[PDB]
Design an enzyme around this catalytic site. Structure first.
Site, PDB file in Angstrom:
ATOM      1  N   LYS A 242       0.858  -1.164   0.000  1.00 41.72           N
ATOM      2  CA  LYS A 242       0.000   0.000   0.000  1.00 41.72           C
ATOM      3  C   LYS A 242       0.899   1.219   0.000  1.00 41.72           C
ATOM      4  O   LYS A 242       1.313   1.695   1.057  1.00 41.72           O
ATOM      5  CB  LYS A 242      -0.905   0.006   1.232  1.00 41.72           C
ATOM      6  CG  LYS A 242      -1.873   1.177   1.283  1.00 41.72           C
ATOM      7  CD  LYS A 242      -2.689   1.279   0.005  1.00 41.72           C
ATOM      8  CE  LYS A 242      -3.991   2.030   0.236  1.00 41.72           C
ATOM      9  NZ  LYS A 242      -3.789   3.505   0.255  1.00 41.72           N
ATOM     10  N   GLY A 243       1.202   1.730  -1.187  1.00 42.92           N
ATOM     11  CA  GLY A 243       2.034   2.902  -1.280  1.00 42.92           C
ATOM     12  C   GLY A 243       1.182   4.139  -1.183  1.00 42.92           C
ATOM     13  O   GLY A 243      -0.024   4.064  -1.281  1.00 42.92           O
ATOM     14  N   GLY A 244       1.812   5.281  -0.975  1.00 37.27           N
ATOM     15  CA  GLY A 244       1.094   6.534  -0.887  1.00 37.27           C
ATOM     16  C   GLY A 244       0.144   6.647  -2.059  1.00 37.27           C
ATOM     17  O   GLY A 244       0.542   6.490  -3.202  1.00 37.27           O
ATOM     18  N   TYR A 245      -1.117   6.895  -1.760  1.00 37.96           N
ATOM     19  CA  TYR A 245      -2.126   6.998  -2.796  1.00 37.96           C
ATOM     20  C   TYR A 245      -3.048   5.794  -2.811  1.00 37.96           C
ATOM     21  O   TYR A 245      -4.089   5.789  -2.148  1.00 37.96           O
ATOM     22  CB  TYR A 245      -1.467   7.165  -4.166  1.00 37.96           C
ATOM     23  N   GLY A 246      -2.661   4.761  -3.556  1.00 40.17           N
ATOM     24  CA  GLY A 246      -3.503   3.594  -3.735  1.00 40.17           C
ATOM     25  C   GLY A 246      -2.838   2.283  -3.357  1.00 40.17           C
ATOM     26  O   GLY A 246      -1.744   2.270  -2.794  1.00 40.17           O
ATOM     27  N   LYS A 247      -3.511   1.177  -3.668  1.00 38.74           N
ATOM     28  CA  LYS A 247      -2.990  -0.163  -3.399  1.00 38.74           C
ATOM     29  C   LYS A 247      -2.450  -0.799  -4.673  1.00 38.74           C
ATOM     30  O   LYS A 247      -2.847  -0.427  -5.776  1.00 38.74           O
ATOM     31  CB  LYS A 247      -4.091  -1.063  -2.832  1.00 38.74           C
ATOM     32  CG  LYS A 247      -4.353  -0.890  -1.353  1.00 38.74           C
ATOM     33  CD  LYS A 247      -5.284  -1.979  -0.824  1.00 38.74           C
ATOM     34  CE  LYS A 247      -6.753  -1.573  -0.906  1.00 38.74           C
ATOM     35  NZ  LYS A 247      -7.654  -2.553  -0.226  1.00 38.74           N
ATOM     36  N   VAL A 248      -1.545  -1.760  -4.518  1.00 35.90           N
ATOM     37  CA  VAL A 248      -1.058  -2.530  -5.652  1.00 35.90           C
ATOM     38  C   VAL A 248      -1.224  -4.012  -5.370  1.00 35.90           C
ATOM     39  O   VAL A 248      -0.600  -4.550  -4.455  1.00 35.90           O
ATOM     40  CB  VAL A 248       0.423  -2.249  -5.960  1.00 35.90           C
ATOM     41  CG1 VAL A 248       0.876  -3.081  -7.144  1.00 35.90           C
ATOM     42  CG2 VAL A 248       0.642  -0.770  -6.243  1.00 35.90           C
TER      43      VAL A 248
ATOM     44  N   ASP B 139      12.241  11.772  -5.670  1.00 28.48           N
ATOM     45  CA  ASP B 139      12.242  11.085  -4.421  1.00 28.48           C
ATOM     46  C   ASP B 139      12.637   9.645  -4.554  1.00 28.48           C
ATOM     47  O   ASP B 139      12.011   8.785  -4.004  1.00 28.48           O
ATOM     48  CB  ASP B 139      10.902  11.230  -3.710  1.00 28.48           C
ATOM     49  CG  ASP B 139       9.736  10.749  -4.510  1.00 28.48           C
ATOM     50  OD1 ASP B 139       9.807   9.712  -5.153  1.00 28.48           O
ATOM     51  OD2 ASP B 139       8.710  11.401  -4.445  1.00 28.48           O
TER      52      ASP B 139
ATOM     53  N   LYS C 294      -2.297  -1.490 -10.070  1.00 27.02           N
ATOM     54  CA  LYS C 294      -2.326  -0.374  -9.149  1.00 27.02           C
ATOM     55  C   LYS C 294      -3.681   0.299  -9.211  1.00 27.02           C
ATOM     56  O   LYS C 294      -4.259   0.459 -10.281  1.00 27.02           O
ATOM     57  CB  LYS C 294      -1.223   0.622  -9.488  1.00 27.02           C
ATOM     58  CG  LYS C 294      -1.165   1.765  -8.515  1.00 27.02           C
ATOM     59  CD  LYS C 294      -0.042   2.714  -8.833  1.00 27.02           C
ATOM     60  CE  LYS C 294      -0.038   3.860  -7.842  1.00 27.02           C
ATOM     61  NZ  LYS C 294       1.052   4.832  -8.108  1.00 27.02           N
TER      62      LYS C 294
ATOM     63  N   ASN D  17      12.088   2.072  -4.170  1.00 26.33           N
ATOM     64  CA  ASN D  17      11.689   2.257  -5.543  1.00 26.33           C
ATOM     65  C   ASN D  17      12.454   1.360  -6.479  1.00 26.33           C
ATOM     66  O   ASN D  17      12.120   1.255  -7.638  1.00 26.33           O
ATOM     67  CB  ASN D  17      11.914   3.706  -5.958  1.00 26.33           C
ATOM     68  CG  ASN D  17      10.858   4.633  -5.419  1.00 26.33           C
ATOM     69  OD1 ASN D  17      11.157   5.713  -4.935  1.00 26.33           O
ATOM     70  ND2 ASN D  17       9.611   4.216  -5.507  1.00 26.33           N
TER      71      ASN D  17
ATOM     72  N   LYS E  51      14.330   6.412  -3.820  1.00 25.04           N
ATOM     73  CA  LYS E  51      14.731   5.791  -2.583  1.00 25.04           C
ATOM     74  C   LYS E  51      14.902   4.326  -2.837  1.00 25.04           C
ATOM     75  O   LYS E  51      14.531   3.858  -3.862  1.00 25.04           O
ATOM     76  CB  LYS E  51      13.661   6.002  -1.503  1.00 25.04           C
ATOM     77  CG  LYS E  51      12.678   7.121  -1.776  1.00 25.04           C
ATOM     78  CD  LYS E  51      11.540   7.219  -0.775  1.00 25.04           C
ATOM     79  CE  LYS E  51      10.302   6.466  -1.189  1.00 25.04           C
ATOM     80  NZ  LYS E  51       9.217   7.348  -1.674  1.00 25.04           N
TER      81      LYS E  51
END
Ligand SMILES: [Cl-]
Ligand SMILES: [Cl-]
Ligand SMILES: [Cl-]
Length: 259
Positions: free
Chosen positions: A15-21, A118, A39, A123, A120
Site C-alpha cells: 500500500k504505497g502513498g495513494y492507492g494499493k497494488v 524522491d 495499481k 523504488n 529511494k
C-alpha cells in the site's frame, strides 16, 4: 473491452502513498493465466508510463477507469535493498552494477523530461532475472538577474540534479550500510542533509569516494550529472570504467544476485 473483473486478485503487494497494488491473475483474453501487478487509485503516472519504455523501467500493459486501474508487469525479484539488508553492505563491483543500470534509467527519464525527485531504495525493484526496474510515480515532475539568487536561476529543487544527489545517497547506503545523513529524529535528519558535512569511510576506493563527493554536492549546479551531459557525465566517471554500456542495456551483463 477490459475491466476490473478481467483480473483476479491474488494479494496485496503493498500500500504505497495513494492507492494499493495487487498481484493479479488475468482470467480472460489470450493472456489468460498471466500474472501482473495492478495499481488502484481513487504530471500523472499513467501518462509518464505510457510514454517511457526502458529495459530498466516497469512496463505498462493496460489502463482503464471505473476508479483508476493500471496493469503493470509483475516484478518477482522484489526489493533491491532487501538484498542489502542481508549482505549488510555491497561491494563496489556489485553496487556498480545496480548504480549503472539505475543511471541509464534516470538518463532516459530525464531525456523524456521527467524527474523522480524522491528516488529511494524502495523504488528499486528487481525483475525475475535480477535487473533493475524503476517503479513508483505521483511524486514526480515535469528582466535582469545580476541580483537574483542562484537557486532561482537554475530552478533548484526542480531540475535533473536532484536525482543525481539521490543516486548518491543510494550509493553511499549500498557501500556503507546506511544513508549519508540521518538523525535521531526527522528534523535532526533533514537538518543534517541541509547543512551537515559528508563523512566518507576510509575503506572506499578513490574512485568511489570521488564519485560520492561529486554526486553528494550541495551546490546543485556543480553536482555531477547537473550539466547537459546528464547521465553521460556520471557514466563517464572512472568508478564505472569497467562497464560495457551496450551489454548492460542489453541485460547481457550478469547481475551479481539472482533472486
Ligand atoms: Cl534541468
Ligand atoms: Cl576513500
Ligand atoms: Cl583497473
Amino acid at each position: 473491452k477490459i475491466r476490473p473483473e478481467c483480473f483476479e486478485l491474488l494479494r496485496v503487494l503493498g500500500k504505497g502513498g495513494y492507492g494499493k497494488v495487487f498481484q493479479v491473475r488475468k482470467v480472460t483474453g489470450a493472456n489468460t493465466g498471466k500474472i501482473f501487478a495492478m495499481k488502484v487509485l481513487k504530471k500523472a503516472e499513467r501518462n509518464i508510463l505510457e510514454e517511457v519504455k526502458h529495459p530498466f523501467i516497469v512496463d505498462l500493459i493496460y489502463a482503464f477507469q471505473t476508479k483508476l486501474y493500471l496493469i503493470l508487469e509483475y516484478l518477482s525479484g522484489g526489493e533491491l535493498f532487501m538484498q542489502l539488508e542481508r549482505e549488510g553492505i555491497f561491494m563496489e563491483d556489485t553496487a556498480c552494477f545496480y548504480l549503472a543500470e539505475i543511471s541509464m534509467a534516470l538518463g532516459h527519464l530525464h531525456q523524456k523530461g521527467i524527474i523522480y525527485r524522491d528516488l529511494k531504495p524502495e523504488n528499486i525493484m528487481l525483475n525475475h532475472q535480477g535487473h533493475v526496474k524503476l517503479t513508483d510515480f505521483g511524486l514526480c515532475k515535469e528582466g535582469t538577474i545580476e541580483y537574483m539568487a542562484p537557486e532561482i536561476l537554475m530552478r533548484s529543487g526542480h531540475n535533473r540534479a536532484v536525482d543525481w544527489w539521490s543516486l548518491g545517497a543510494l550509493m553511499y547506503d549500498m557501500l556503507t550500510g546506511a544513508p549519508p545523513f540521518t538523525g535521531e529524529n526527522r528534523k535532526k535528519t533533514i537538518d543534517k542533509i541541509l547543512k551537515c558535512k559528508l563523512n566518507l569511510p576510509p575503506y572506499l576506493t578513490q574512485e568511489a569516494r570521488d564519485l560520492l563527493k561529486k554526486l553528494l554536492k550541495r551546490n546543485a549546479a556543480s553536482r555531477l550529472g547537473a550539466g547537459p551531459g546528464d547521465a553521460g557525465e556520471v557514466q563517464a566517471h572512472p568508478f564505472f570504467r569497467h562497464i560495457n554500456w551496450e551489454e548492460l542495456l542489453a541485460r547481457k551483463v550478469e547481475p551479481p544476485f539472482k533472486p
